[PDB]
Amino acid sequence: GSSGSSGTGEKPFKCVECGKGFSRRSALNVHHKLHTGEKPSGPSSG
Numbered sequence: 001g002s003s004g005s006s007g008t009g010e011k012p013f014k015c016v017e018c019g020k021g022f023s024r025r026s027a028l029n030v031h032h033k034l035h036t037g038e039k040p041s042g043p044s045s046g
């Protein structure tokens with residue numbers, strides 16, 4: 001079997017979409033763009 005979660009960091013910056021962990025207020029802002037915008041799936045009419 002496998003066990004031993006030792007992947008902690010306590011980063012100050014975190015994504016509001018997944019909760020990632022960054023170090024600067026820039027790298028996190030860029031990773032966000034990835035969230036806002038995905039393949040053409042689910043026509044959300046408006």
Ligand SMILES: [Zn+2]
Nearest residue numbers: 015017018020
């Ligand atoms: Zn994210």
